[PDB]
Design a protein around this ligand. Structure first.
Ligand SMILES: [Cl-]
Ligand SMILES: [Cl-]
Ligand SMILES: [Cl-]
Ligand SMILES: [Cl-]
Ligand SMILES: [Cl-]
Ligand SMILES: [Cl-]
Lengths: 340, 340, 340, 340, 340, 340
């Protein structure tokens, strides 16, 4: 957990995040060309960052956002496929792991159901070791089929990695779920458009803190014909403190070293802000002093999670009373999204 | 949701938070004296803040932290009791609601089990309308009996209020639970000691954003013989933007107006960052476009919450593998907290 | 007055500001081409921002700065004209209002007097509803004919709008004049070049506060052969707090919702910082308590404004004693600007 | 215009501002005692700040705020009087000029009309050289009789000084009026209570910039039984950049050197942001190039100032349409302030 | 190198810094009383910070600044002496190391030469393991005899510690000298008075970075009759990033864990910003590629250091040409300091 | 020392720094083309900045970084040469001085030894008045032959200028060496790649403060195939306060006026933070009061500098014990850099 050098050591994973300029693309040929630009970029970056072990690209960095439905379907990728092979070769050549974005990935029922929005983790031998499908697509504007699972994978030097996408990160639950599965680094890849710049910068830091996890964020930049993306790719410590952070600049890069031994030492020996431990051992001191055992309390005391787990339809109904009953709102209509 | 005036209108609740200097007290008489100081403060503040509808004091503002066990037991309060009556009279006189701290509140089995750490919400008629017992005590150093429930109460002008305490706020789950019950304001009362100053400032803002809720934070200041408390009491909008924030100064005050109609308009008509709505309607656009209904997906896709709810002992075991198996650590021992 | 969503409601106006990359243009054909780029941008942005009601472009976004006098004269626009029609069509297609820049607009005595520097407000039916000519051109370098009037126009959802340009905003008087005419939003369009970046960011916020008005700022970006423009387009609340702010990035966008009912509620019920009210009712409490009526004092107590209004030549003379007597300075000469 | 040393030179005025802890006083004897505390403070400070030429204390630093009317009347000062003599002796002993606050100063019709809220500038020989009565009292809560005039006085080393008070500074007009009279330093003395902390920090800087003037701000700190005062006393350059700024700490001090020759060189040779010059020579380049003389335009183009000057009752009526017609509001009533 | 917990592990040293309120004292008895207050504070702090291994107090925290010469001489301490014994007992009781300030420490020729300004490092057995005498007293106002040596001592858990005082830290040379002797933590104890607040906050961070060293800063707070001290005690990583930082509050505390293994891993394996290594191996890549050996260049290429080392009188003369020839300046005279 | 205008006066030097987009070049023809782009830029900038006296470009702005050895050798420049003539003509035409970068400059033994990394200062008559060869190349990645000397040259209006390059600035020694030679402005030209953005922003400010010198920094921007450069070109006062600072934007510009008389007045009359004076007159007050002369102490009390000067091999050995013995590290190998 240290910032400012280009090296890495046996204890540190060298992580690079990229403020990748958002592509504005329309065909499969243009996607492949851009995929090769990304590959070239990986290779060049390793020349300057000899400590690089992990390189992270934004959601949508490969295809851009395919606003047109037909083009979306025409350019949806197979995993493994040609794009991923192009990425894998860069990872082998530069001897790094990498996180790349396929937007879309063909649905099992392609072309009759919406593509997933997917991330892969590729190791330094070119192997896909994690494929993550976004669980919370950025509705209403974006139309991806939602995925249903998080994953933890052993990464460079044994660092445990989970991947999440853009909108996912607004939801504390996903960051929790990954850390509780053992994630030591949560990588948030995004094409996070203005407006919500300061809110997203803060969310990543707060989530690093709340889940005692390293966080790496690669966000897109530039204007793509619809959205302007605000950059601020960052790597953040498990103590909530930013390691390094980009600005809004096109193809900015940040690079930081995250210590394996430091996070494991913290998760073992931290007390007051060992949040993962403490959530499941509530009031341990109190119970000890009251003659009630030395484990604290594990039971979930939050009715919302309990209802959600046992009766999601009831939890949905409850939330519709507080918000609205239809996915759309007549005060700000959107074609294809129903309201009233 | 507006900052800088001393007024309030029929649409706004005037909220004041206090950077109350932490008391260093030892007897029941000294607690009562301090309670009367708080009452005097409420009355005086209303003279300057004619728009005040809600006044918020820090956790421990009444008793200080009773580090000595015997003194803890001797000064633990009854609710309703003498302290709360002293507070109620100030609320009636100044025609405001208030949030006060009783640390401890006598356990049902007093003096044979540890006191709770409690907050009350008192209305402008002197009535206790919410009593909240802290669910996540600040273990290891602090020895309160944990509570088990959140509450939502109709507050000034109909504003829905939930109370939480200090350490509670590090845990996104509680902020979620309150908002999902309908809370429009979550009041976090704390005696949050250094070191974790920047992390706590950020957490409150991130939680306001993530749960589309007003947040008010009253934190203690000063040095009490053990801890130095970092202030930065604040009121924060439901869009994640700070309204006003104190520094570390003793008996600082902040004051902001939070609009009833604005939060209800937002929760109704917000789309991209309607996080409460969106969590329980995932991928609605995608499902619509894939011919699968217009509600998105409600089902909880996070194995951690599911395991926690169905088998808390398993979730505890899982977390002990990632952290440690005993509440204490031999590398940083604490008397009465077991380790190895 | 809320930030982070892409929606808008019946109570909120959805405002988008653009960090438009400064053009480097030379002919009428190139201006028309760029005008069409702006139009395309409006249409695309509305696809991503369904709540957009008002889109704002920088001063000079259409023509760039025509440094060459001949090119300036050759490209000066008629209002209404071809450029404005191109903008109007985008406003109708995207169903938004827009603020566009014509630099120059032909003088009544074109080509024998310098063009104005002009802004139009175009409604969602394509109609020009306000034409503002800059009152304080950025002398010495820029040679526009000064305009002489501010305007207030009923905008989207009834929101009262005044337009001002760049250098204008350094002068508190203009922001006052607009608010005193009833403006609820002052839109400051600029091609504000480095150096004065932090000063201009602050001025906008201070003016929002001092005049209890929403403020929207669209500033140019990039290097155009002469100047580098610093971006930091922003929307700011009537309480002085930034809603969202761009960085220095080319074609950044910010978007915020400004509440109609909130500003009207504030201007009605604010007391201590109701600056518009208080300026013309000075010392009301004091006069009441002194038995002198319940209106305070309205009379202007500032000799400078009085002299300026009654004898501008005297006020000019006075200022020349404090500064210098000629528009130019021999220590930093500029061709065509006299000194000594 | 330079920060960080304790010295001063023949070109620089050494200015010290004090975050003076707000007194809570009730009698004339207690005022006199506190006045002597201030005197002792001046003398001690000069021991540490050998470059000190000007020392600035907060509004209300002498009396506190006399909330009780009877006590207000009983403690209202004569100028010159006993308090001012106590201050004068400190100024002679420490060989500095000073700015002190008398709240109240007896009205000509004392005790039958409300006291003024007054500031004096005392030179290093003990002489009162400026007496300023606040033009815009902080209504509604504060009940001072409004003054009607600004002043410019030759200060230490010839530096031209104007004094203003607290609420005054929210109004750009007063800062303008002083600078237009020749002020090179505007001293803003305040007991500026929370809430409006960030807004006031920004206002001072913006006013320094807009009026090409040094600004010094001394603000009170602490809690006085009613209000908490936020400190952030500061000295600011004529270019809008802070020299030094206090935090919220009780009896903080800041100290900066402001160059005489630098402001005079700037006001003479600045061009693009010579705001005082440019306001009264609008569009000079344009008029030159259009064959219309080389002075630009002086005429006031802002209808609000013109109406205010010629018909203040009309300007008042106009503003009541935009805000409200009575000084009070039934939604937030205050005893003695009428509404409906 | 991690922030926010109260624990420490076998790899981390738990460092606490104190924003100790500056005493205003006059006699030996009052010094002893205050020394006991400090001791009580250490003991209490350890109760809250079970990970504390090192506690740091400000320069002057024991005596205050003895402005009066006679009182200075009367209260100058012996080391070891009564004060240090009082500190040692607290260190043994709380099982921590500590850094305390003796101002003055008796000169070998006491009372005929000025006292030193001294710091001790006391281990957890009560033993004085380092005594540092300030090399660069804060002339002109402060009159301590200058010391002549830095020291490195093995501290808690083997962490190498050097101590420096206040004004010392403005001079990059001292931070270099300590790190080059092997210091892994440089502790800067100060009573750093306003004005130079932001400059000192930055200096510490820059020095941490430039010398790849942990830095801990304990600075005094409050007003002592002469100076106001600005706090902002901090612990900073060897990568230049702040761990935690106090504000200006009286008796604030910060606490951070600094990893032994992380700094040693960095100093071993860092490349691009291994500043200690690189200073003495300049241009290694270039020399390798030019066929000139694989060590780079060690020779000091800076004529100033060379002249300083070989002929300090010449280096002094040189600097007097650039600044002034006498220690005093007639433009800002100080009694006892000669000028002209 | 003032920010925000485009003018300059007889007392001020108008300095412009450029966030020049890093070139990606391969041949001598492409270098010459880019050199002409820089020239065109200088000329255009002067049109907008009539006060410009000094224009500063980033290290590598002319050639980019020639990563390929053969291309490095093929494009290495002669000084004076064709590139410098192209720059000189721009300086004469725009009547400014300029700082340009030749990377490489041919070694005396070209092409058999690595090129230098060089900066020139060109006066407004086209004359090269300073040629600086980088003393601390950015090893390991960059392979320039190290230079061995700093220089001070009389610049525009007599302002004394020293030039330094990129990595140089991490080392306080060089900034000292220049100031001690009389430098009043140190110009740091850089192509400072991410990661170390915040550290470099801070270093420049800290060095301005520590050496009582103006500092100007021109840093490259953009991505060049290997590195992303973080901009934040800046001009900084001799008091450590930023005048103006760019962001990360391509071809940003900043411009500030630095006063000749202000720095000379400060270096003459500053006392407490006259760091250049004080370093060589330590403890002057103390020695005076102890009867030991009125000059303080000049002798260098830092063993590291003494050893470095007398025995650089010993100082190298010492540092290798603290860091590592070989220029390379087996944990992060780099081809051509030896380790183990
Ligand atoms: Cl999505
Ligand atoms: Cl607790
Ligand atoms: Cl203009
Ligand atoms: Cl008032
Ligand atoms: Cl000293
Ligand atoms: Cl280099």
């Amino acid at each position: 957990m240290r910032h400012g050098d280009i090296s890495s050591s046996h204890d540190t994973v060298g992580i690079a995040v990229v403020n990748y300029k958002m592509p504005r693309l329309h065909t499969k040929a243009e996607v492949i060309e851009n995929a090769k630009k990304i590959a070239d970029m990986v290779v060049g970056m390793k020349q300057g960052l000899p400590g690089m072990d992990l390189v992270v690209f934004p959601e949508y960095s490969t295809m851009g956002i395919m606003y047109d439905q037909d083009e979306m379907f025409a350019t949806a990728a197979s995993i493994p496929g040609e794009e991923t092979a192009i990425f894998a070769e860069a990872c082998k050549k530069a001897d790094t792991w990498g996180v790349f974005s396929l937007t879309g990935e063909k649905h099992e029922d392609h072309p009759n159901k919406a593509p997933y929005n997917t991330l892969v983790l590729i190791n330094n031998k070119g192997e896909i070791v994690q494929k993550y499908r976004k669980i919370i697509p950025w509705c209403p504007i974006l139309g991806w089929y939602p995925g249903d699972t998080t994953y933890v994978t052993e990464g460079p030097k044994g660092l445990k990695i989970s991947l999440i996408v853009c909108d996912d990160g607004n939801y504390p639950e996903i960051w929790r779920d990954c850390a509780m599965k053992g994630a030591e680094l949560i990588v948030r890849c995004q094409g996070y458009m203005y407006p919500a710049k300061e809110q997203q910068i803060m969310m990543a830091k707060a989530m690093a803190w709340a889940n005692n996890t390293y966080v790496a964020v690669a966000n897109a930049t530039g204007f793509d014909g619809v959205y302007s993306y605000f950059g601020h790719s960052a790597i953040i410590g498990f103590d909530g403190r930013t390691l390094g952070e980009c600005g809004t600049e096109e193809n900015g890069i940040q690079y930081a070293e995250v210590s394996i031994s430091q996070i494991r030492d913290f998760r073992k020996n931290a007390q007051s802000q060992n949040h993962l431990f403490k959530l499941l051992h509530r009031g341990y001191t109190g119970l000890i002093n009251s003659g009630e055992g030395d484990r604290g309390v594990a039971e979930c005391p939050f009715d919302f999670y309990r209802t959600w787990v046992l009766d999601a339809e009831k939890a949905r109904e409850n939330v519709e009373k507080i918000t609205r009953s239809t996915v759309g709102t007549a005060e700000c209509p959107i074609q294809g999204i129903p309201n009233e």
